[PDB]
Structures are given as structure tokens and as C-alpha cells.
Design a protein around this ligand. Sequence first.
Ligand code: HEM
Ligand SMILES: OC[C@H]1O[C@H](O[C@H]2O[C@H](CO)[C@@H](O)[C@H](O)[C@H]2O)[C@H](O)[C@@H](O)[C@@H]1O
Length: 153
Amino acid sequence: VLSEGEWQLVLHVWAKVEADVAGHGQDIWIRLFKSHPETLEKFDRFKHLKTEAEMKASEDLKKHGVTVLTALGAILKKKGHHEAELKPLAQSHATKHKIPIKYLEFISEAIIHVLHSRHPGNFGADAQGAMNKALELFRKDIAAKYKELGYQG
Ligand code: HEM
Ligand SMILES: OC[C@H]1O[C@H](O[C@H]2O[C@H](CO)[C@@H](O)[C@H](O)[C@H]2O)[C@H](O)[C@@H](O)[C@@H]1O
């Protein structure tokens, strides 16, 4: 359970992400797909992208990053009370997309790397720690839901 102070560190850096959610999403995808290429294979719609240039030029990939980060943002703003938000997410990711917890760890790593890079003003050690704590809570709760839905994760 995160403290209010920790949630504020998470929300303060997210406020910067919201200045340009599309741009942050693009950097996050490039970071993820380059660090862990296997994660790209899960996207039937984007698995043909061969280079960073192609990824950056993809309007649909950009749009999907907006969708993903906006959904994550809504979860973070709930400050732990995200039961309603996790239900549909866990169901599609467990049953349809089949995304292991390990891949959620990969994207969490990508998110943190991008925030560390773009936002040193609001992503110092304490802020990164709070963001990690928030993402671990997210994955923990998703893992529990995966279990209830019958997916090993
Ligand atoms: C921060 C974690 C994540 C969030 C908030 C998230 C969010 C979303 C949202 C909101 C959608 C659209 C609605 C839906 O299908 O549920 C979606 C679709 C999808 N997600 Fe995720 N996702 C996350 C991580 C991942 C990861 C790590 C992978 C893959 C390695 C993944 C693969 C997919 C796929 C395959 C789709 C469908 C893409 C398409 O429209 O063709 N997601 N995700
Ligand atoms: O922070 C690094 C550790 O990250 C992962 O573990 C955290 O998140 C898991 C959920 O994704 C939890 O089960 C674990 O308890 C958390 O510490 C990774 O699995 C660990 O190997 C890393 O050390």
C-alpha cells in the first residue's frame, strides 16, 4: 500500500507525461520493443514493424500508445482503488492477448526508463521508487485477477 506522499510523486510526474501523452507513448514502445523484441510479437497489428523509424512513423502505434497510457493514467489516479479499471484489462490481457506478468514487468521497465530520461526534474530516486511501487501494485493486482480468470500469466 502506497502512502499519499508516494502517490503524489507518481501523479506529479504523470502530469508531465500528460503534456504530450502521444510522444511519451512512442518513446515507451521503442524502448520496450528494442529491449525485449519478443513483446512485439504479441501485437498482430504491429509485429511487422522492423525498425525504430517504422515504429515512430506508425500512426496506429502512436494511437495505441495513447490508449495504453491513458488507461494506465486512470488506474494511477485511483491510487490503489482500481478494482473496476483492472477487471476489463485483466480479462483481455489474460484471455485474448495472453500477456505474461513478465511482459508487464518489461513495459513497466520501459515506462520508468522513459520517465527517468525525459523527466529528471520530477523523477529522482524517491519519485522513481514511488512509481515502481505503484506499478508493482498494478502487476500484483493484475496477477491475482489472472489467477481468478484461469490464466497462469
Ligand atoms: C501498463 C500495462 C498495460 C496497459 C495499461 C495496457 C492497456 C491496453 C489497453 C487499454 C488496450 C485496449 C483494450 C484492451 O484490449 O484491453 C490494450 C490492448 C492490447 N494490449 Fe495492452 N496494456 C498493457 C500492457 C501490455 C503488454 C506489455 C502487451 C504486450 C507485450 C500488451 C498487449 C496488448 C495487445 C496485443 C493489445 C491489442 C492491440 C491491438 O489493438 O491490436 N499490453 N492494452
Ligand atoms: O524490482 C525488481 C524485481 O521486479 C520483479 O518483481 C516485483 O514484481 C513481481 C511482479 O511483477 C513481484 O512478484 C515481486 O514480488 C516484486 O518484487 C521481478 O520479478 C523480480 O525478479 C525483480 O527482482
